[PDB]
């Protein structure tokens, strides 16, 4: 806790610290901490500082020592890739290191086993073919800065090296850079050293990102190209580069977006792409109106800066063709899109207020919508307007009101879209999957990281459930690895134990005693509400501390105690959001379509005769998907890419300390350092330790009369370190972090004689290094001076 | 193009013009000559140049590769927190120390000409001098 | 006669990032670069906010014109050679600001070959030629 004073009790002349107290901090939301120097005369119980960075007034002020943090003064952040290698890993230190690297355009930085990637919001040209080649063909990969290609290389290296499947997991907030990382990593995997015969299957996989972004991405306030779903891929890369087989899985597609969008938010790209992009012939074929002339599409949001939908659309048509879709197949896809868009524009009115019907002006519109969707218009009209209640014993033919028929119409638009999207994926998989399945594959998950908002719904619950499963994966692989290491050197794995989220998993998933188990049972109930669900949850989950109720709206709100903190969810419309799946008889009308693609949309979709079955609901079906997806990932060796959005402004070189720190917490970058420090963290071979800690005791080091495993135990006993800080090991000297830091202090104490010499040496070399950098910029300077003089003549 | 022959005659002596005078003329025309361009022609025709050589010198004084991104390099080098702003004191020390060094007055003048404030946007300072 | 002012001035602005005030830590790098060494008391006695004019005065008062780098090797002592990887051992042990590249640069500049020992009488000698 800040070693600012000498033995005399006097402050070290110039002693720099980090601090959370400054007017700069008050006046600037971007800055969290400032650099200070501890003023001469400062007291032990309370310090007197002066701000040095960012520049200040010079005014001395007081801070309690619990607001002073150690400074990593005199350290080049571009000199090394892991945050853990810093002498001090406190919050302001870790943040600064990340900042300096960011502004020097080094975004990737590890926190073993994590790779932090800060969104530059600018093309750095670090993922070019020239960069893929460098990262692919370099002799010793370690003599290269951290990169997503570092992770892709390492992953493909272990897959082929020990014949074990691998999974790269890209996570973070919306607009942090997951999809871009995912696209870079794939681009690298597609670069072959000498070629690819399975180029047709590779070309189809690469043709899948534009297609998937068109149908699955949208312009949100937070991201202009926001992935509205979870993506999982299984790849089969040749050891010399080149994808050979693949399998794509989309999940949790945002259904609501097809119907309505918030403002400054668009629908799915394809709607915009297709309407601005379709040619004269295409427009008449389907009868297309302008982007503004469609109900399901927010008419204000229609344009996105830097996005050219006409050009993007051309690229989608080519991509669909490269996915081995015929001109007919493509024409069927766009007839279904024109159908979804046209059906939305059908108006419904109350037919007194008893039942409802189609507006006569809109009858042709309705019929065209069904034709385009290759559906029977009469039978579709029937399902939207005829209610078949089962009152008492018998079936009772009744009619749907305006609001209800509007909901069933919207249900069709949504279901038809989602199913078309999933079919496009299913078709791609048919042309890219290996006939007998995957022996050893390369997994790739592009999932939305932990989500916290002002109001959290069922959408964020499913995301935060998935994110709990991945965190379990992190902590288990952290343990597994560090535990196998100790075991191999014959060390006690006893002082090695850390937190399990098993307690919050049970409260969220476990059948019978979980939020999701009581969400399912309430949907299946012949009379269950959002209040009844929370009341049942607050009564049956008192056994674990992870389920807690709410202060304001106690029966409407509930809060779960996640790994990353307490997240409050609003149970309003939770029962509605789980029941949002197409209603049995309409599905039969679709399955009876003459067109082979429309028949294929709802293949084996079991009929909904009575009230919604277990596996029909969104929550139930999703837990099955997640469990299956998880077990497959738990089978592979993981890799973690953590993405950080540095600013809310989508701007380059704009660092925002507070936002960035919430992210360092949610992605466990800080905990990744914590875990790496614990136990016997310093581990280096007998030969290594002796090159390093030679001068602790030069006598025991400089000796032939003793072996290397024994030279070390001599130095260590003589050193002072308690046997409580070091273990000998089989091949490696295992030293605790604290022990290894003390041991260095002993070595420096021995070379007290060398201090002034090494000072002068280092200092002179830096002065030289410094002038050399200034020489590089001297031809540019000569220019500013030539023009200053040119400007002076003109007077 | 004609100003070239107009300016030449004014400082010329027996058909030949001194580099110091030839450089001054290049500035009047709107070109930015450095000690390199002067050492380039000195290395080819001496100190006094004919009309034929004068043009050949103004040919080297044509610096097209000149733009804000190219000029800021040195100022950008000392903007360690990457704000896009340097003090007048910082910028004065750069202009008066390395390269074709300006007088401590020439530097103050040009920085005071651009802004009143101590903190100068060197991207704008460079854009301005180039004009 | 030997006026180091031009060399002192430039060095201050290399460490001070062209500003006219250096922070303590960087002043210590600066003075050390000219072979100056201060005692913990001498240091404690310095002004908290060191400026250009202070440094230039101090530099004149403390720079050893007759023998800079006396701390690497003294010509008035006598015992000046040690193994190459031994030197680097001490360099790394004292947590140098220098990287694996800077260290090797210093090595081929001073040591012409790969001769088993590195002589300090030559380390001081080469650094003085690079003042
Ligand atoms: N590595 C990067 N280099 C340049 N721009 C990037 C990078 N990563 C992200 N971006 C920009 O940020 C936007 C949003 O990032 P994206 O990866 O698509 O979001 P998400 O994290 O939600 O998947 C991109 O469309 C792109 O403009
Ligand atoms: Mg995305």
Q: Is C53 helix (H, G, I), strand (E, B) or coil?
A: helix
For helices C100-110 and A755-776, give the axis angle rounded to 10 degrees.
Answer: 100
d(CA A217, ligand 1 centre) in Å: 13
A664, containing H or E segment:
helix A657-666
The span from the CA of A646 to the CA of A181, in Å, is 16
Q: Where are the alpha helices (DSSP H) in A489-529?
A: 502-508, 515-523
Nearest to A347 by CA among A400, A402, A300, A398: A402
The span from the CA of B52 to the CA of B29, in Å, is 17
C68 touches chain A (CB under 8 A): no
Question: Which residue puts its alpha carbon closest to atom 13 of ligand 1?
Answer: A175
Domains of chain C by range and CATH? 5-62 (1.10.238), 81-128 (no CATH)
How distant is the Cα of B74 from the closest Cα of chain A, in angstroms? 5
Q: Report the b/e string of A396-420 with b at 16+ CB within 10 A.
A: eeeebbbebbbebbbbbbbbbbbbb
Question: Which residue puts its alpha carbon closest to atom 11 of ligand 1?
Answer: A121
Residues within 5 Å of ion ligand 2, judged at the Cβ atom: A 179, 227
How distant is the Cα of A146 from the closest Cα of chain B, in angstroms? 22
Chain A residues in contact with C28 by the CB 8 A cut-off are 14
Question: Which residue puts its alpha carbon closest to atom 9 of ligand 1?
Answer: A177
Q: Which two tokens stand for residue A645?
A: 């959005």
The span from the CA of B131 to the CA of B108, in Å, is 20
The span from the CA of A573 to the CA of A561, in Å, is 22
Confirm if A659 and A173 have CB atoms less than 8 A apart.
Answer: no
Best mutation target, B80, B92, B97, B98, to test chain C (most C CBs within 10 A):
B97
Over the Cα atoms of chain C, what is R_g? 16
Chain A residues in contact with B104 by the CB 8 A cut-off are none
- Please provide residue A461's backbone torsions phi and psi, each rounded to the nearest 5 degrees: -65, -50
Instruction: Give the residue from chain C lying closest to A744, CA to CA.
Output: C93
Q: Is A737 helix (H, G, I), strand (E, B) or coil?
A: helix
A364: left (phi > 0), else alpha (psi -120 to 50), else beta?
A: alpha
Most ligand 1 atoms within 8 A of CB, residue of A125, A180, A642 to mutate:
A180
Q: Which two tokens stand for residue A598?
A: 């429309």
Q: Say which of C15, C85, C94 has its CB closest to residue A758.
A: C94
C-alpha distances (whole Å) from A203 to each of A210, A289, B128 are 12, 34, 50
Most ligand 1 atoms within 8 A of CB, residue of A148, A152, A177 to mutate:
A177
User: Which atom of ligand 1 is the closest one to the Cα of A117?
Assistant: 1
d(CA A453, ligand 1 centre) in Å: 21
Chain C residues in contact with A697 by the CB 8 A cut-off are none
Q: Give the CA dihedral A274, A276, A281, A287, nearest 10 degrees.
A: 80
Q: Give the CA dihedral C55, C57, C59, C61, nearest 10 degrees.
A: -150
Q: How many residues are listed for chain A in this entry?
A: 795
Experimental method: X-ray
Nearest to A151 by CA among A630, A643, A634, A629: A643
What distance, in Å, lies between the first and last C-alpha atoms of chain B? 19
Nearest to A444 by CA among A617, A638, A596: A638
Interstrand relation of A637-644 and A166-172 (parallel, antiparallel or unpaired):
parallel
Widest distance between CA atoms in chain B: 56
Task: Residue window 10-69, chain B: list those with CB within 8 Å of chain A.
Answer: 24, 27-28, 30-36, 63, 66
Q: Where are the alpha helices (DSSP H) in B15-103?
A: 19-29, 35-45, 51-60, 68-77, 88-95
Tell if the CB–CB gap between A751 and C93 is shorter than 8 Å: yes
Nearest to A556 by CA among A574, A531, A537: A531
The total of other beta-carbon atoms located within 10 Å of residue A60's CB is 15
Nearest to A605 by CA among A381, A425, A613: A613
DSSP at A554: T
Which amino acids bring their CB within 6 angstroms of ligand 1?
Answer: A 119-124, 172, 174-180, 223, 225-227, 643
d(CA A177, ligand 2 centre) in Å: 7
How distant is the Cα of A223 from the closest Cα of chain B, in angstroms? 26
C-alpha distances (whole Å) from B74 to each of A112, A780, B68, B98 are 36, 7, 11, 10
- List subunits contacting chain C, requiring 3 or more Cβ pairs under 8 Å: A, B
- Please provide residue A114's backbone torsions phi and psi, each rounded to the nearest 5 degrees: -90, 155
Interstrand relation of A637-644 and A114-118 (parallel, antiparallel or unpaired):
parallel
Does the annotation list A176 as a binding residue?
yes
The span from the CA of B68 to the CA of B70, in Å, is 5
For helices C120-128 and A755-776, give the axis angle rounded to 10 degrees.
Answer: 30
Name the closest ligand to CA A647: 1
Question: Which residue puts its alpha carbon closest to atom 25 of ligand 1?
Answer: A225
Residues near A477 by beta carbon (within 8 Å), at least 6 away in sequence: A113, A637, A638
The span from the CA of A11 to the CA of A789, in Å, is 49
Does the annotation list A584 as a binding residue?
no
Name the closest ligand to CA A228: 2
> Hey, which CATH number is domain A443-635, 3.40.50.2300, 1.20.58.530, 1.10.1240.10, 2.40.280.10?
1.20.58.530
Confirm if C89 and A695 have CB atoms less than 8 A apart.
Answer: yes
C10 touches chain B (CB under 8 A): yes
Interstrand relation of A442-448 and A166-172 (parallel, antiparallel or unpaired):
parallel
Q: Give the CA dihedral A282, A287, A292, A294, nearest 10 degrees.
A: -120
Q: Which two tokens stand for residue A686?
A: 């007998």
Tell if the CB–CB gap between A770 and C14 is shorter than 8 Å: yes
The span from the CA of B115 to the CA of C16, in Å, is 23
Interstrand relation of A230-237 and A442-448 (parallel, antiparallel or unpaired):
antiparallel
A122 touches chain B (CB under 8 A): no
Tell if the CB–CB gap between A790 and B30 is shorter than 8 Å: yes
DSSP at B116: S
Nearest to A217 by CA among A208, A227, A207: A227
Tell if the CB–CB gap between A788 and B95 is shorter than 8 Å: yes
Instruction: List the beta strands (DSSP E) in A187-343.
Output: 217-218, 226-227, 230-237, 243-251
Q: Give the CA dihedral B53, B56, B58, B61, nearest 10 degrees.
A: -130
What is the separation of C-alpha A198 from the centre of its chain, rounded to a whole number of angstroms?
Answer: 30
Does the annotation list A529 as a binding residue?
no
Q: Where are the alpha helices (DSSP H) in A667-732?
A: 669-677, 686-692, 698-701, 708-719
C-alpha distances (whole Å) from C68 to each of A761, C59, C64 are 12, 12, 5
The span from the CA of A548 to the CA of A557, in Å, is 10
A592, containing H or E segment:
none
The span from the CA of A586 to the CA of A383, in Å, is 6
d(CA A446, ligand 2 centre) in Å: 7
Q: Which two tokens stand for residue B33?
A: 């000559």
The total of other beta-carbon atoms located within 10 Å of residue B55's CB is 13
The span from the CA of A57 to the CA of A70, in Å, is 22
DSSP A264-275: T---BHHHHHHH
Tell if the CB–CB gap between A783 and B27 is shorter than 8 Å: no
Chain A residues in contact with B70 by the CB 8 A cut-off are 780, 783
Beta-bridge partner residues of A235: A246, A442
Tell if the CB–CB gap between B71 and A784 is shorter than 8 Å: yes
How distant is the Cα of B47 from the closest Cα of chain C, in angstroms? 30
For helices A178-189 and A199-206, give the axis angle rounded to 10 degrees.
Answer: 170
Does the annotation list A178 as a binding residue?
yes
């Amino acid at each position: 806790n800040v070693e600012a004073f000498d033995k005399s009790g006097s402050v070290f002349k110039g002693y720099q610290i980090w601090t959370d107290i400054s007017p700069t901090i008050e006046n600037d939301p971007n800055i969290m901490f400032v650099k200070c120097v501890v003023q001469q005369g400062s007291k032990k119980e309370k310090l007197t500082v002066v701000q040095i960075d960012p520049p200040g007034t010079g005014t001395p002020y007081d801070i309690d020592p619990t607001h002073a943090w150690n400074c990593n003064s005199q350290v080049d952040p571009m000199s090394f890739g892991d945050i853990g290698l810093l002498n001090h890993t406190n919050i302001p230190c870790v943040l600064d290191f990340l900042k300096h690297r960011y502004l020097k355009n080094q975004i990737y930085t590890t926190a073993v086993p994590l790779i932090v990637a800060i969104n530059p919001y600018k093309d750095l040209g670090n993922t070019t073919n020239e960069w893929i080649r460098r990262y692919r063909d370099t002799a010793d990969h370690t003599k290269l800065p951290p990169h997503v290609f570092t992770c892709a290389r390492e992953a493909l290296s272990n897959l082929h090296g020990v014949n074990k499947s691998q999974t790269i997991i890209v996570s973070g907030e919306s607009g942090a850079g997951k999809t871009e990382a995912t696209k870079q990593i794939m681009r690298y995997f597609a670069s072959s050293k000498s070629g690819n015969m399975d180029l047709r299957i590779q070309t189809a996989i690469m043709a899948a990102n534009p297609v998937l972004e068109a149908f699955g991405n949208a312009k949100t306030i937070r991201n202009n190209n926001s992935s509205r779903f979870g993506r999982f891929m299984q790849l089969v890369i040749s050891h010399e580069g080149g994808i050979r087989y693949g399998s794509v899985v989309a999940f949790l597609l945002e259904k609501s977006r097809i119907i309505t969008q918030d403002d400054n938010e668009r629908s799915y790209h394809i709607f915009y792409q297709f309407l601005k992009g379709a040619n004269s012939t295409m427009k008449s074929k389907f009868g297309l109106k302008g982007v503004t002339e469609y109900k399901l599409l927010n008419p204000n949001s229609t344009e996105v800066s830097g996005v050219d939908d006409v050009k993007d659309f051309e690229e989608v048509i080519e991509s669909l063709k490269n996915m081995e879709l015929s001109e007919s197949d493509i024409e069927v896809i766009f007839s279904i899109v024109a159908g979804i868009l046209t059906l939305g524009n059908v108006r419904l009115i109350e037919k007194q207020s008893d039942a409802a019907a189609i507006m006569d002006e809109d009858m042709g519109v309705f019929n065209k919508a069904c034709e385009l969707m290759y559906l029977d218009p009469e039978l579709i009209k029937r399902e939207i307007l005829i209610k078949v209640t089962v009152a008492g014993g018998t079936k009772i033919e009744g009619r749907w009101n305006k609001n209800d028929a509007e909901v069933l119409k919207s249900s069709l638009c949504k279901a038809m879209y989602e199913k078309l999207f999933l079919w496009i994926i299913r078709h791609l998989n048919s042309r890219i999957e290996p006939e007998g399945g995957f022996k050893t594959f390369m997994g790739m998950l592009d999932i939305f990281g932990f989500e916290v908002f002002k109001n959290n719904s069922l959408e964020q619950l499913f995301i935060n459930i998935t994110n709990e499963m991945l965190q379990k994966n992190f902590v288990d692989i952290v343990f597994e690895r560090e535990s196998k290491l100790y075991k191999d050197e014959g060390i006690s794995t006893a002082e090695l134990k850390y937190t399990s989220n098993k307690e919050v998993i049970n409260v969220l998933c476990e059948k019978g005693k979980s939020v999701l188990s009581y969400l399912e049972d309430q949907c299946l109930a012949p009379g269950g509400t959002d209040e009844k669900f929370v009341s049942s949850c607050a009564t049956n989950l008192k056994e674990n501390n992870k389920f807690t109720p709410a202060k304001v709206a106690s029966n409407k709100n509930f809060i779960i105690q996640h790994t990353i903190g307490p997240i409050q969810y609003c149970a309003e419309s939770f029962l509605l959001k789980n029941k949002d799946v197409l209603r049995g008889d309409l599905v039969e009308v679709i399955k009876d379509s003459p067109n082979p693609i429309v028949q294929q949309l709802f293949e084996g979709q079991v009929i909904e005769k009575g009230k919604i079955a277990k596996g029909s609901l969104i929550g139930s079906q999703f837990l099955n998907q997640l469990t299956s997806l998880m077990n497959l990932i738990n089978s592979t060796e993981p890799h973690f890419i953590r993405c950080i959005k540095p600013n809310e402004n989508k701007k380059p070189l704009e660092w925002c300390e507070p936002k960035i720190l919430i992210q360092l917490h949610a992605l466990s970058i800080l905990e990744a350092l914590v875990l790496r420090q614990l136990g016997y963290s310093y581990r280096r071979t007998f030969e290594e330790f002796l090159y390093q800690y030679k001068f602790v005791d030069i006598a025991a080091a400089e000796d032939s009369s003793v072996e290397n495993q024994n030279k070390c135990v001599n130095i260590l006993k003589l050193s002072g370190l308690s046997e409580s800080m070091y273990k000998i090991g089989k091949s490696m000297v295992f030293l605790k972090q604290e022990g290894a830091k003390i041991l260095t202090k002993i070595q420096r104490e021995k070379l007290v004689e060398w201090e002034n010499c090494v000072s002068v040496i280092e200092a002179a070399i830096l002065k030289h290094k410094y002038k050399q950098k200034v020489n590089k910029n001297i031809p540019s300077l000569l220019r500013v001076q030539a023009h200053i003089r040119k400007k002076m003549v003109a007077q | 193009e004609s100003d070239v022959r107009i300016y030449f005659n004014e400082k010329s002596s027996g058909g030949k013009i001194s580099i110091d005078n030839a450089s001054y003329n290049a500035r009047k025309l709107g070109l930015a000559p450095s000690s390199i361009d002067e050492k380039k022609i000195k290395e080819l025709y001496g100190d006094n140049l004919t009309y034929e050589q004068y043009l050949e010198y103004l040919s080297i004084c044509v610096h097209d590769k000149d733009n804000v991104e190219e000029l800021i390099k040195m100022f950008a080098h000392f903007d360690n927190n990457c704000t896009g702003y340097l003090t007048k004191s910082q910028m004065k020390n750069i202009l008066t120390t390395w390269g074709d060094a300006l007088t401590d007055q020439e530097a103050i003048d040009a920085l005071n000409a651009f802004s009143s404030e101590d903190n100068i946007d060197y991207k704008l300072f460079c854009e301005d001098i180039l004009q | 006669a030997s006026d180091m002012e031009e060399k002192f001035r430039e060095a201050f602005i290399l460490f001070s990032s062209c500003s006219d005030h250096i922070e303590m830590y960087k002043f210590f790098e600066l003075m050390n670069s000219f072979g100056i060494i201060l005692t913990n008391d001498e240091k404690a006695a310095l002004p908290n906010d060191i400026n250009m004019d202070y440094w230039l005065n101090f530099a004149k008062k403390h720079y050893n014109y007759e023998q800079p780098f006396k701390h690497i090797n003294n010509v008035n002592e006598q015992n000046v050679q040690i193994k190459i990887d031994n030197f680097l051992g001490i360099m790394k042990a004292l947590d140098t600001r220098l990287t694996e590249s800077d260290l090797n640069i210093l090595l081929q500049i001073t040591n012409p070959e790969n001769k088993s020992t590195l002589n300090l009488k030559t380390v001081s000698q080469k650094l003085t030629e690079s003042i």
